[PDB]
Every structure is written in structure tokens, then in C-alpha cells.
Amino acid sequence: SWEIDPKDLTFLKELGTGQFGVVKYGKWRGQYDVAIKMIKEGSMSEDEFIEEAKVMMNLSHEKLVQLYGVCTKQRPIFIITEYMANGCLLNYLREMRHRFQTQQLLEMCKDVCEAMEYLESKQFLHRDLAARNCLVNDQGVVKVSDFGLSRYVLDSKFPVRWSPPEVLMYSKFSSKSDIWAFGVLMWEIYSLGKMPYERFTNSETAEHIAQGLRLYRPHLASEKVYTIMYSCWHEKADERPTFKILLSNILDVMDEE
């Protein structure tokens, strides 16, 4: 049920290339738009990824980048997922031609928050939530991509700038580390793709965070939006809200402004 016949695929255009592999745009069975992620050899723990791909099949939500299947009878293995015509959210934010309204930015945050509240309702962690791991479709809808994928990367590259103090100190991952990452993601949305702690190294950022210091308010963020994103960064993990509470807060702010 999780396996796709690679012969059902037609490759139309290359979307990206990196140490993770090559991503191409294509069609499934002649008409269905798909993204084909060809995994670089030796880059991933492939047996484990195949086992958990079946679990990822049942994760279905309108704001999750949907997994259609995997091709594992050949090398490189393929991950067949939803096609998102406007690509990476980070690059999308950095394109200044869009002249974004803060209303569109809050809508982006709400998209991501709905996806994350669904994942939380399934007790599934993303473990690498960030704008570089979000995608934008032709309608402008933002969806969460590559959830749980870092568990199978075989590997300086750790997302220090998206990590709470307990992760940086003792590697304690939980739903609250996803919450912290979501706060940093709202920051980078309202900063139009700016790098968190842009004038700091990863080491300086870790020291900054352990000292209790935080990011501060992006210019496009109102007081209520900043309050929402700042609430994700409480030093005590259990004092950080849930994604359901964050969704309520964002909906309230959308109604207010």
C-alpha cells in the first residue's frame, strides 16, 4: 500500500539538487502532479525509513505535505510526495516582490499551526520545524514538509537556532521542542526569511539562549503576534503552550486585526 511503481512516473523538470539528493517535478499515471525525491546513496537509514513510511501514510491533513509513497525496489530510492509549485517557504519569504500583508503572514502561521496541531494530536514530532522545511503551493497555502525525516539522516548542521535550551543542553526532544521551533518559525515568517540570530554563530546562539536571552520583535509583528511567538520560548518546557492553544491564539488575533 506504501509502494509506488516507478514506471508510473514521468519526469518533467528538476526542482533542486543537494547533499540530500535530487528533487524533480513529475506526473503519476499521466495526470497527477507529484514531487519525486531521489535519495542520495548512503545518506539515509533506508530500512528504518521504509518501516516508518507506512506510519507516515496514515498522517493525512490539508496542511501536511502529503506522502504518496516510496519506490524501494531500486537505487536510488524515491519518495513520492505532494507537489508545491511555489517551493520552499524560506525562499518564498525572501522574495521581496510579493509585498506581503501581515494578514498573509498570519495566515502562513495558521497553516503551519494547524498542521502541527494535527501532528501533536497524533503524538508525532517534526523534530526539525523551520521555514526551510515548509512548502508553498500554487494557491499560497503553506504546508509542513519532511516531518520526522531527521530521524533517518545518517549525516555543524544541527538546527541550533531552532532549538530550546533543553535540546541544546541535554538533547531532550519533546512536543515542547516542536513548540519552540514553531515560535522561531513565526519569527522568520514575520522577518521575511531573515536568519534567526543573524549576527551570531551557532555557538554564540547557544550561549545566548542558555543565558535566557531571546529573539526580539520583528518589525512586521504586532504586539499580540509577538506575544504569541514569545510564548513558545519559555525556559520551562511545560510552561510553553500546546499547538491547540497557539491555534486558538492565532485565530483570535486574526479576528482582532
Ligand SMILES: O=C1[C@H](Nc2ccccc2)CCCN1[C@@H]1CCCN(c2ncnc3[nH]ccc23)C1
Ligand atoms: O525536498 C527537499 C528537501 N528534502 C528532501 C530532499 C531529498 C530527499 C528527501 C528530502 C529539503 C528542501 C529542498 N527540497 C526540495 C528542493 C526543490 C523544491 N522543493 C519542492 N518543490 C516543489 N514541490 C515539492 N514537494 C516536495 C518538495 C518540493 C523542495
